[PDB]
């Protein structure tokens, strides 16, 4: 479960990153 929450908040953290460069 960790490891889901981990991966959850990574990727919606890179969404957000590339939604600011684009
Ligand atoms: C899975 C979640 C990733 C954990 C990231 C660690 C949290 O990040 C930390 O949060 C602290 C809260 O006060 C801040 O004080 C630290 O400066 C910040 O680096
Ligand atoms: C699934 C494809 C998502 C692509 C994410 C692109 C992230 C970088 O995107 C590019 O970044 C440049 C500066 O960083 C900007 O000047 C460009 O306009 C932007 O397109």
Same mark, same amino acid.
């Given at each position: 479960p960790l490891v889901? /929450?981990?991966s959850i $908040? /990574?990727?919606l953290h *890179? $969404? *957000?990153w /590339? *939604?600011?460069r684009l």
């Open positions: 889901v /929450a981990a $908040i /990574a990727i *890179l $969404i *957000l /590339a *939604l600011d």
